[PDB]
């Protein structure tokens, strides 16, 4: 057994497979960051920090000695508890295809939103600066008329190019802007056709964020470090319910302030 | 012989071949559900029920015993009788290529319509809840102006995504809406070109339904279980006509309330 | 793990082996039905219903369509909870041969009695008509004088024969009648010697029933369908006890009303 203690839960192999399958596809349907930042191979549960390579001054241990601390970023463990009914679990083996996995899906959405918000908007208590904080390019305002969205994206692109940043470039849109872009026509012409051909990368569904981002996916700019990737573990149970959780241990680092452009809602 | 008793019908092999060809191709031209739902391999004439995996409380058989009935969905047999003239039948062997199979086509249309309506709109006497009853996403209103159809479809897609449901996504349209979508332009630009590229799946001809559906075809959400697939059997004949029928025995189960969006006409 | 969750029980392999051995042998000592009816191979936890082959009229889905629901018999799950002391459990590994399995035996008796009563006397809540409801031959009265039992058994056999039902024939006796038959003499001659040679099949110990049955075991008349056979699963434990259960999921169908004769006490 590992720290997850799956083996102690009154959950069948079949139910585990359904629960995992749901957590993963739901997580994947909400997550945007992983589609554009570099995602590392999980390094295991021992990992507690990512070295930044920097030195920090501290007072010397004595005369004639110069001391620096090695600086690093701590990993954060994010855990989302959820509760499933034991009838949902047990029904799987009897051949149920509609066991209530809503709590899994809700937990998966919560975790994806937390991850994407950390990456894009910062998580100060976990010492994560988001792309919003890291960016050094002029911030752009998303227009009132959806028909002008291609104007601001074009301007974001030129900002990246002028900052000397190679592509390809991707755009992350909030749920609201994504929907507007996908439906809006200008004098009959779908702005999505215009916007799609303008960007050599992808136009990404990013429901966790407000506004939009335009950034390079050249690599080496945005570091999502995984200690342990999305996992499902066991907490407790009674006669009727099982309490489980989704968790991951990771951090995010932004190495290049000019590789991104933020667009506010 | 099997229950169809085809062998007792005064219908030649040649006529049988024509009747089948017509029934199948007509059926396929009208049917929409089978293009988006999971359609099982026919399990044969013995199958009467589909296990749902669930338990129903019943009063115990004595003290200290706990009893539960196993829940299942019954299959329904749908039979559509039709009558053909014996001159239509007999002309076939004589080289006729215009024998009157109108009654075959009328039966096939009737069966497809009954099947699709059961799938999408439900059939309470057969204990079938259709996708319309099943869905838990906000129901959307089709616009008066066809030029706005892409707006509602886009909102529908966003409902599916926000519900954590992966694609691909397909759109089913009533005969009326399909025809409108295929002909309508906004400032000259065909809204079909916009809508077709908006949907990674298909835009489906669904003449049996009113309004529209946008659903995921990821698999495992919508279950059409075939006992026996569309078949042609024999009832009776007189000097001038033969009474045949089309039939199938099946049921439909919807496992995921959030995998579809309904749009009302 | 499967739905039994045996692995979560604080019960050693040795104790499990003892509990099983006791449950099975106790079960077999009380059960009578399985000795005369057709007992199917367990079909697994997915099975929920047994097709009867019949059709039920339902209102049609529209004009010119004829609809019928497929009839099936639902399986019932019978569960008999029981509690054992943890000292009974733990003593096993220490070499104990008299651990208290009384609660296991009480559960097995309770289950056998519930099964046999369902088979012979019916279980309306589970939609099971027993042989008693099924039979169409004249019901016979067991005599006050045990010395006359061979008369009624002989009349019963004659009822079966006249109904055109081939043997071999077996006789099931209540605990009371069995004991009477085994001890009683007429003018010194044991009526058991007469009765045993009169019946080509067996005289069966049936402590679950009152009265008696004489039935054919030619096969295909009496159908005990097993979803899952007698099993031992785990519910909960505290410091001193473990709550387990016996269960099976099954149903019983009687296909031939004239293949049995009932004799009332």
Order of helices and strands of chain A: HEEEEHHHEHEHEEHEEEEE
Category by helix and strand content of chain A:
alpha/beta
CATH topology grouping of the largest domain in chain A: Major capsid protein gp5 fold
Give the helix level of chain A as a range of percent.
25-40%
Q: In CATH's first tier, which class of the largest domain in chain A applies? A: Alpha Beta
Major protein interface: B-C, 42 and 42 residues
- End-to-end C-alpha gap of chain A: 47 Å
What is the multimeric organization of the chains shown? part of a larger assembly
Pfam family, one (chains A, B, C): Linocin_M18
InterPro entries (chains A, B, C): ENCAP, Encapsulin_nc
Protein name (chains A, B, C): Type 1 encapsulin shell protein
Keywords (chains A, B, C): Cell membrane, Encapsulin nanocompartment, Hydrolase, Membrane
Q: What are the salient characteristics of this protein?
A:
part of a larger assembly, 3 chains, 265 residues, alpha/beta, Major capsid protein gp5 fold, 2 domains, 5-stranded mixed sheet, 4-stranded mixed sheet, 7 helices, 31% helix, 31% strand, flat
């Amino acid at each position: 057994m590992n720290n997850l203690y799956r083996e102690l839960a009154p959950v069948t192999d079949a139910a585990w497979h359904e629960i995992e399958t749901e957590a993963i596809r739901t997580f994947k349907r909400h997550i945007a960051g992983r589609r554009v930042v570099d995602v590392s191979e999980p390094s295991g549960p021992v990992t507690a920090a990512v070295s930044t390579g920097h030195l920090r001054d501290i007072s010397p241990p004595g005369d004639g000695v110069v001391a620096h601390l090695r600086e690093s970023k701590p990993l954060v463990r994010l855990r989302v508890p959820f509760t499933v009914t034991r009838s949902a679990i047990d029904d799987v083996e009897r051949g149920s295809q509609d066991s209530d996995w809503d709590p899994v899906k809700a937990a998966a959405k919560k975790l994806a939103f937390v991850e994407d918000r950390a990456i894009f908007e910062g998580y100060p208590a976990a010492q994560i600066d988001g792309i919003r904080q890291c960016t050094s390019n002029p911030v752009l305002q998303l227009p009132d008329d959806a028909r002008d969205i291609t104007d601001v994206i074009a301007q974001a692109l030129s900002e990246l190019r002028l900052a000397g940043v190679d592509g390809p470039y991707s755009v992350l849109l909030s749920a609201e802007v994504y929907t507007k872009v996908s439906e809006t026509t200008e004098h009959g012409y779908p702005i999505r056709e215009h916007l799609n051909r303008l960007v050599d990368g992808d136009i990404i569904w990013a429901p966790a964020i407000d506004g939009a981002f335009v950034l390079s996916t050249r690599g080496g700019d945005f570091d999502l470090r995984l200690g342990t990737d999305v996992s499902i573990g066991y907490l407790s149970h009674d006669a009727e319910t099982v309490q489980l959780y989704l968790e991951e241990t990771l951090t995010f680092l932004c190495y290049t302030s000019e590789a991104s452009v933020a667009l506010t809602p």
